[PDB]
Amino acid sequence: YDNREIVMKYIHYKLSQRGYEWDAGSEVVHLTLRQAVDDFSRRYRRDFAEMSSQLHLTPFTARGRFATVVEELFRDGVNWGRIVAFFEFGGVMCVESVNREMSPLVDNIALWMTEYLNRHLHTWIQDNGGWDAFVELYG
Ligand SMILES: CC1(C)CCC(CN2CCN(c3ccc(C(=O)NS(=O)(=O)c4ccc(NCC5CCOCC5)c([N+](=O)[O-])c4)c(Oc4cnc5[nH]ccc5c4)c3)CC2)=C(c2ccc(Cl)cc2)C1
Ligand SMILES: [Cl-]
């Protein structure tokens, strides 16, 4: 499995489902993630809605805001649900970057998500069965 491909295909899906074609953006993990993320957004739509309105996103503060939320999301540890929420939050910032006329941020956000998966979540994901376990548990 490829963390970068999973991030890239999700963002392209999230932005396309908001009417935007993201330029820079096995098959079962993408399908399972997109369904799990949609399920999470449905169940926590108010949190999704209020997260966009409270971001105060500028190119100067974008990374500090991304890192602060991701830090808090995994402060108490990692599970598959928080990983799904991690993807959904990354989608918020990408849609919000496009809405606020800051589409270049999508490529930076894609990189920050890939880095976090490669360097901080990778060991937990591998030790808890990898994405194979994720698709088995929820796909
Ligand atoms: C500053 C902040 C950090 C503060 C906090 C918040 C918001 N928080 C984030 C964490 N959150 C969590 C965390 C864990 C869990 C969980 O139970 N975990 S679990 O037991 O491992 C698991 C259980 C079920 C599925 N799947 C169901 C399947 C059913 C059949 O269809 C396919 C899917 C999965 N799974 O991996 O799919 C995994 C969870 O509950 C659910 C419930 N239903 C879910 N459906 C999909 C995921 C999911 C999680 C919700 C609560 C909300 C902030 C915030 C704000 C906006 C955005 Cl945008 C983001 C974050 C900001
Ligand atoms: Cl990386």
Residue numbers in the entry: 9 to 33, 90 to 203
Authors' text:
BCL-2 is the founding member of the pro-survival class of proteins that includes BCL-XL, BCL-W, A1/BFL-1 and MCL-1. They exert their pro-survival function by binding and restraining related members of a family of pro-apoptotic proteins—the sensors of cellular stress (the BH3-only proteins) and the effectors of apoptosis (BAX and BAK). Four or more hydrophobic amino acids on successive helical turns within the BH3 motif engage complementary pockets (P1 through P4) in this surface groove of pro-survival proteins. Venetoclax competes with pro-apoptotic BH3 motifs for BCL-2 binding, releasing pro-apoptotic proteins and allowing apoptosis in cells primed for death.
Recently a novel BCL-2 mutation was described exclusively in patients undergoing treatment with venetoclax. This mutant, G101V, was found in chronic lymphocytic leukaemia (CLL) patients from the clinical trials who had initially responded to treatment but developed CLL-type clinical progression after 19–42 months. The BCL-2 G101V mutation reduces the affinity for the drug to BCL-2 by some 180-fold. The BCL-2 G101V:venetoclax complex crystallised in P21 spacegroup with two molecules in the asymmetric unit diffracting to 2.2 Å, with well-defined electron density for both copies of the drug. The overall structure of BCL-2 G101V was similar to WT with no significant deviations in α2–α5 core helices or α6-α8. The binding pose of venetoclax is conserved between WT and the G101V mutant. Interestingly, the G101V mutation did not alter the positioning of the α2 helix relative to α5 or impact the residues defining the P4 pocket. Instead the additional bulk of the valine sidechain was accommodated by a deviation of the sidechains of Y18 on α1 and E152 on α5. In the BCL-2 G101V:venetoclax structure E152 had a 60º rotamer change relative to WT (mm-40 for WT to tp10 for G101V), placing the sidechain Cγ in van der Waal’s contact with the chlorine atom of the venetoclax chlorophenyl moiety. This conformational change in E152 in the BCL-2 G101V structure causes a small repositioning of the venetoclax 4DM and chlorophenyl moieties in the P2 pocket, moving on average 0.25 Å closer to L137 in the α4 helix, i.e. more similar to the BCL-2 WT complexes with ABT-263 and compound 1. Additionally, introduction of an alanine at the G101 position did not provide sufficient bulk to displace E152 in the crystal structure and affinity for venetoclax was maintained for the G101A mutant. Thus the functional consequences of the G101V mutant are felt in the P2 pocket via the ‘knock-on’ effect of E152 repositioning forced by the additional bulk of the valine sidechain.
